[PDB]
Amino acid sequence: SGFRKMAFPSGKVEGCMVQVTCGTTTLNGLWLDDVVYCPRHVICTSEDMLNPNYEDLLIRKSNHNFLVQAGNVQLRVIGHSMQNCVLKLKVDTANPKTPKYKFVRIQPGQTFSVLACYNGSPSGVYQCAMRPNFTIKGSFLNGSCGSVGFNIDYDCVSFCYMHHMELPTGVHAGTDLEGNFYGPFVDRQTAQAAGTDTTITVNVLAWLYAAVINGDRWFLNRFTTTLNDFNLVAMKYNYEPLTQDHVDILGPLSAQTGIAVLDMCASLKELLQNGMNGRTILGSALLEDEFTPFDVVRQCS
Amino acid sequence: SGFRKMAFPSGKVEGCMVQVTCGTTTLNGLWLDDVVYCPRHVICTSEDMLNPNYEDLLIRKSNHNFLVQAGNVQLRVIGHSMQNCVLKLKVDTANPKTPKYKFVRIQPGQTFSVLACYNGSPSGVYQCAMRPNFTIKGSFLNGSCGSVGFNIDYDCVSFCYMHHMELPTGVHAGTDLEGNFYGPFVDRQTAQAAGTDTTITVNVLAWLYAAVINGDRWFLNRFTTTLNDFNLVAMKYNYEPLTQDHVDILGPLSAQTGIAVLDMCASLKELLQNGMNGRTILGSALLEDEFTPFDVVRQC
Ligand SMILES: Cc1cc(CNCCS(C)(=O)=O)ccc1Br
Ligand SMILES: [Cl-]
Numbered sequence A: 001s002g003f004r005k006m007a008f009p010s011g012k013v014e015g016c017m018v019q020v021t022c023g024t025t026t027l028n029g030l031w032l033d034d035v036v037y038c039p040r041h042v043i044c045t046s047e048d049m050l051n052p053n054y055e056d057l058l059i060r061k062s063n064h065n066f067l068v069q070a071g072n073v074q075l076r077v078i079g080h081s082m083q084n085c086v087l088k089l090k091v092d093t094a095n096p097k098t099p100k101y102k103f104v105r106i107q108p109g110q111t112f113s114v115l116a117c118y119n120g121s122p123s124g125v126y127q128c129a130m131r132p133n134f135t136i137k138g139s140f141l142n143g144s145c146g147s148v149g150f151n152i153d154y155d156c157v158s159f160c161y162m163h164h165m166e167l168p169t170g171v172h173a174g175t176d177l178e179g180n181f182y183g184p185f186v187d188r189q190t191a192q193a194a195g196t197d198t199t200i201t202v203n204v205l206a207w208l209y210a211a212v213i214n215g216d217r218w219f220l221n222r223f224t225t226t227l228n229d230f231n232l233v234a235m236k237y238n239y240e241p242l243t244q245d246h247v248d249i250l251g252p253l254s255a256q257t258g259i260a261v262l263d264m265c266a267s268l269k270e271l272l273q274n275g276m277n278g279r280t281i282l283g284s285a286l287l288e289d290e291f292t293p294f295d296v297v298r299q300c301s
Numbered sequence B: 001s002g003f004r005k006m007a008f009p010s011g012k013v014e015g016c017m018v019q020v021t022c023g024t025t026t027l028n029g030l031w032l033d034d035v036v037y038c039p040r041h042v043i044c045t046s047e048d049m050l051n052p053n054y055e056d057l058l059i060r061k062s063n064h065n066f067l068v069q070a071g072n073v074q075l076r077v078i079g080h081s082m083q084n085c086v087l088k089l090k091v092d093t094a095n096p097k098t099p100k101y102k103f104v105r106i107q108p109g110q111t112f113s114v115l116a117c118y119n120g121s122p123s124g125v126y127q128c129a130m131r132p133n134f135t136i137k138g139s140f141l142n143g144s145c146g147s148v149g150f151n152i153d154y155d156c157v158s159f160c161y162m163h164h165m166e167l168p169t170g171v172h173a174g175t176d177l178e179g180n181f182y183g184p185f186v187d188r189q190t191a192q193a194a195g196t197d198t199t200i201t202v203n204v205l206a207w208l209y210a211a212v213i214n215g216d217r218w219f220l221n222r223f224t225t226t227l228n229d230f231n232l233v234a235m236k237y238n239y240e241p242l243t244q245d246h247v248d249i250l251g252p253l254s255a256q257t258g259i260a261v262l263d264m265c266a267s268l269k270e271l272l273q274n275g276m277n278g279r280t281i282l283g284s285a286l287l288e289d290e291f292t293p294f295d296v297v298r299q300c
């Protein structure tokens, strides 16, 4: 037993991290087959970043303006193009460490592992959720840009995130690997704030199941409720609505414990109103919302 | 900006994880050069659980009683020996993925990454600390036995923990990679209980210094304290005594932030007295004790 914020093993992704330099800017790229993926803002000077014309800045650029380094080996760039906010550098050599992979776009509430890198060198792994306001509460210092987020499904790496920038509040904004932003953000130096964030209700519920599975049962009660009743409470506390689909995804956990989602919703309703009466759940004084139902089943079963 | 329980990249450890089978028992082994390290309890059955005579059970085994599997490849055992509570199976192939490594025994309060593994397949990675009572609050199911804890400093993997057992309170007990247990525990399923756990005071202080660095000052006060007065208070909340060693260790974070170690100690005494009054520090509504002074300087 025990319950921890757990990342996927990072090794299949560590094998894909390179350093990309354009002028004075250095950051991380993802090397898969014969292409290196990195944020297009690597082509910007600090002057450029206030109002960049990426079209113009890039036609002015050529292959030789890009220094790709895989540890102690220079990769030769033989092509360059832009997909949305991502720069694709074609290289002369396929990554012999390319895993089975696809590019996937995640939904808010979904979790993924982040390999934090500095100078194309993997430094840390941590599990994140994509927030309802499309930011992530990561840990990123300068040179972190181009760090990626991923899931593993058997042998297949699903790449879902690339880090572009930190917002004024300390939270982070990035794209999928096709360079589409998550959330209403642009890759320019400008005034950008995260929306007011919400709590991922289905994830809180999943985590209450994890707590019960690990013997932390105090908050259970004899009561049940309804989606409509609960959701008027949720909306009140800046919780996402619980849909019937959320209820069905918790299904397995509802079985293994005998606590039906609206049964557990009544526990949660009461924690939102009355609080934790001091106590903790899985060594947290907060209602944790960065474990999905899948995460709880995966780690506990 | 941001502050997260960050684990080390697990890749150098993933290339060393194999499956070890003996009798009907399967758990994880660590493949470094021509040696596979696993818990010696792999050679026990039901009737050997309470009072295993390990020297007696191991002399009755031949090399071919051990089935070592690295993915699809079967490894050939050519030798076995026991060092303390760890079994060392010699194999005919050196692991070509062996990273630079060492074995270190850590002290309570130190942090490390765990790679939780089942059937020699890595399942996930998380950060832990050695608690003052010599347990770890891990996440471990049946079959995770022989999973390892490590640090990675400057490309060298420092192995500091191998998982052996879960105690009745749901916390975890293991050995260093020389097979010596952390704490008073033994590889017998005889009744054992960990000491009352305590909060790692030096870690809480480092994490408060981290809060100040990332721009949180709400919990500072105008007070200072003597070391001795701080300990008389902190022990009433089951906090570990703070030593002059702990004070020296915080000197850098003190100098970085301009707050004296004993001023920060006054702030902690007040937080223990008041709680957080509906506020958070680095996103926590509790006082975090699984970040070391070193960890806070690395991540920040
Ligand atoms: C002493 C000890 C023995 C065991 C024996 N394995 C557990 C079940 S079985 C019959 O498959 O081996 C485990 C841990 C310790 Br600690
Ligand atoms: Cl140590």
Ligand code: NA
Binding pocket: A220, A221, A222, A223, A224, A262, A263, A264, A266, A267
């Ligand atoms: Na209930």
